[PDB]
Design a protein around this ligand. Structure first.
Ligand SMILES: Oc1cccc(O)c1
Ligand SMILES: Oc1cccc(O)c1
Ligand SMILES: Oc1cccc(O)c1
Ligand SMILES: Oc1cccc(O)c1
Ligand SMILES: Oc1cccc(O)c1
Ligand SMILES: Oc1cccc(O)c1
Ligand SMILES: [Zn+2]
Ligand SMILES: [Zn+2]
Lengths: 21, 29, 29, 21, 21, 29, 29, 29, 21, 30, 21, 21
């Protein structure tokens, strides 16, 4: 999930936007 | 050392800023 | 409204800590 | 919801838990 | 400045990008 | 109330996230 | 990396506070 | 109220920064 | 105390240092 | 890496949240 | 103290509460 | 730069002031 995706390497703001409602 | 926990705190802040009025679900699982 | 924007930033950090493994759903609208 | 409840007065930790999954 | 522009109405990340180097 | 001071604190966090490796000047005024 | 990312977030907040009215320049190399 | 609660959040961060190894007592009062 | 002193007008880090251990 | 220092920053925010009107003593070194 | 107990392994809010006034 | 100086060891407030305008 997000922790695996975004805490091993930095997620861009676009990648983060994936998780918005 | 509790870096996943600390990373999560920054992650939700970043999500908050990106998502705006859309909001977001955060699941650590 | 910036006041709501700043409050929400604190809200999601508090939810992060209090919700733990459950995570949370931030829906301001 | 959370903004009207918790930005207008201080929510307790139990009150914040309403918004957990 | 940035405080005047962004502390009453919310500046989007897109608008904030104008302040980057 | 210290609202401009607190707003600026959130602003620099937002700028950090948006600007990435570009960096930024913060010049209040 | 992540680590450096999270560190930079705390760095900008400390600069904001210590620099006060001067502001600061954040340039990750 | 909420303004003081949000302010207090930033105060503890500034105390953490300035007090260093000494630490601090925070009492809302 | 600190909230009265520092939430209505800004306190410098030097003023805040009064609250250190 | 400055891990303990950055961790402490989060610890004080978590004490602020949980202790409420009681406040807290943060005493890093002890 | 708190750094030893809580920066090595995650402390819950209940565990952290032991450090309140 | 700042990341090298201050992410590998703890910078003092005086060292941080180097990066003020
Ligand atoms: O990958 C991440 C993790 C935390 C914050 C962020 O902006 C990006
Ligand atoms: O009512 C609130 C608002 C922001 C943070 C918090 O813990 C409670
Ligand atoms: O307009 C603003 C003010 C503060 C933070 C932010 O992301 C936007
Ligand atoms: O007067 C204040 C209030 C909150 C944070 C700070 O650095 C100063
Ligand atoms: O174990 C920890 C360390 C830092 C913040 C926190 O909420 C818990
Ligand atoms: O070396 C550092 C890193 C982050 C914050 C700080 O005040 C000092
Ligand atoms: Zn704030
Ligand atoms: Zn951190």
């Amino acid at each position: 999930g997000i922790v695996e995706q975004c805490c091993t390497s930095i997620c861009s703001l676009y990648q983060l936007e994936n998780y918005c409602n | 050392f509790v870096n996943q926990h600390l990373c999560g705190s920054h992650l939700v802040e970043a999500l908050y800023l990106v998502c705006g009025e859309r909001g977001f679900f955060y699941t650590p699982k």
